[PDB]
């Protein structure tokens with residue numbers, strides 16, 4: 281069947297909307313990105329730390345969030361010439377405003393009943409809560425999807441997501457999935473080029489590629505934001521800005537490769553998703569630093585790297601409806617496998 | 631199939647838990663009441679008005695609420711020697727901590743995923759939100775149950791709930807259910823017999839029936855708190871109770887007959903259904919209608935609300951509408967609730 285997925289991460293830049301076909305395999309049919317208004321971003325951020333009148337405030341904020349998500353769905357369906365009746369369900373992550381598994385709770389807003397009302401499509405949402413109820417951390421949820429896509433009996437694979445930070449799913453045959461953070465991804469390269477050039481990121485890693493790595497600075501870094509970095513830059517002589525960028529690229533490449541090889545030395549394939557997959561200069565370094573592995577974008581395996589996360593939530597909607605587990609308890613720490621999410625039906629037919 | 635219903639109203643005394651059998655009819659198999667600890671009641675009251683750190687406070691409070699609910703569920707099933715496997719679903723209202731349809735939101739807590747984890751039973755919850763999302767008030771929900779129980783496009787009926795106060799669901803041939811308030815119910819009779827003899831209520835209305843309606847007072851009252859009664863009484867004990875009974879009987883019957891003069895049957899639920907003397911006067915004052923307890927239709931008057939929520943779980947799973955749009959103001963009929971499956975472990 282066909283499923284929509286909606287993901288809005290913690291950076292609050294915007295919402296990913298995806299349409300998948302799910303059968304034997306998972307395939308991306310269409311995708312759509314919608315920016316988040318400054319006002320909505322600011323209002324969500326203010327809910328991410330304790331404050332006054334949170335119940336009412338969250339209620340007003342989630343209504344705007346859902347309206348935006350619904351518009352995003354509408355536009356994708358218009359582009360695809362698809363009726364909402366052709367979509368089995370939307371898997372919506374919602375928007376995390378508090379995550380405290382040590383206190384046994386996780387809070388994602390995004391009024392799924394309202395989302396069902398506005399879209400006319402069944403909504404599956406609230407995926408993390410059952411994992412936390414079963415004693416897990418409620419995160420990360422993507423490794424179960426990584427396993428469904430890429431796990432097999434025969435190959436040691438690492439599925440590497442390079443966003444602001446880097447995280448990996450280790451798919452070792454005959455074993456359960458493992459997952460951990462590898463280190464920084466794009467976070468410092470973004471911050472540096474912003475501080476220096478006003479750009480939000482370094483396109484294709486071209487700026488970095490134009491500079492030369494400074495090995496002294498690199499050693500200091502290996503031994504994450506700007507105040508931290510500035511404290512480092514003061515300890516070294518003035519460097520050209522591009523050399524700093526080149527050095528920051530190498531930091532991520534080395535931190536990732538070192539963490540990956542330490543945990544899975546026999547790794548045969550590293551499959552890279554997230555926006556970092558588009559940083560050509562970074563992909564180049566990762567491949568040089570892991571010469572015994574094939575390092576490639578997930579695009580080469582039929583999953584476009586920018587849309588992996590959104591696709592996971594579409595997939596989680598499918599898992600719910602099929603009553604199959606959606607978590608990976610070895611990674612989340614839950615007592616065992618659980619069906620994740622809650623169903624808010626459109627019910628258009630009355 | 632069999633369904634559990636879970637209700638915890640805003641008085642916060644305890645949880646009503648019922649077990650129904652649903653087929654062609656709705657029948658009560660068992661019921662259980664679980665008092666709420668003072669500490670939990672206090673913390674919920676504190677979340678019913680705006681205050682600090684609400685997200686985290688509500689999260690931790692609802693964990694306790696759910697643990698209690700799960701205990702109530704396990705206890706009822708134990709009492710019946712019944713495996714949770716025999717139950718299709720729990721319909722859980724949750725606990726209302728904020729309700730503001732004017733700002734298009736309603737908030738019931740009660741972490742249904744945790745409820746499913748602890749009970750091992752599918753949970754349907756969060757019933758009010760889709761009605762609100764469709765432009766309705768999100769309340770009251772019980773008239774949809776009244777309509778399903780007693781509605782048909784051919785007889786004029788009223789379902790009268792007598793609690794502290796009185797409300798009625800009008801079932802008119804063909805029409806969606808409508809509803810309204812009809813003034814006081816048990817509130818004054820309870821207030822007065824408490825103040826006068828320390829009793830919580832007037833059992834069977836026998837105190838009121840031992841007295842005579844003083845017609846002066848009745849006319850005054852007809853022209854609601856304990857000191858409000860005492861204002862009236864000075865300008866003039868069992869006669870008083872009798873006159874309070876008549877007050878409710880007259881105001882209720884007059885409201886009902888204005889709205890549907892054609893009423894053929896008045897079905898009474900709530901604890902007032904047990905007030906034999908009140909029921910007698912209501913029957914005298916609506917002589918064209920048969921006045922009877924819902925118990926005469928297999929629906930125990932004290933357990934309507936719990937039963938309504940087990941029924942709403944059934945309606946969700948049957949893919950049938952759950953709201954009463956002519957009551958709530960919603961755009962039309964909607965499936966109410968969200969499903970949190972127990973699944974496998």
Ligand SMILES: CC(=O)N[C@H]1[C@@H]2OC[C@@H](O2)[C@@H](O)[C@@H]1O[C@H](C)C(=O)O
Nearest residue numbers: 290376379386419420421422423589
């Ligand atoms: C509570 C929450 O929203 N966690 C997110 C967050 O954003 C990234 C990281 O922290 C990850 O643990 C998780 O999301 C990804 C998509 C995941 O669940 O795998």
Ligand SMILES: CC(=O)N[C@H]1[C@@H]2OC[C@@H](O2)[C@@H](O)[C@@H]1O[C@H](C)C(=O)O
Nearest residue numbers: 639640726729769770771772773935
């Ligand atoms: C928002 C909310 O919890 N409403 C309750 C409340 O308690 C009584 C009254 O206000 C009624 O409107 C409703 O419950 C009843 C059972 C209902 O929904 O029919």
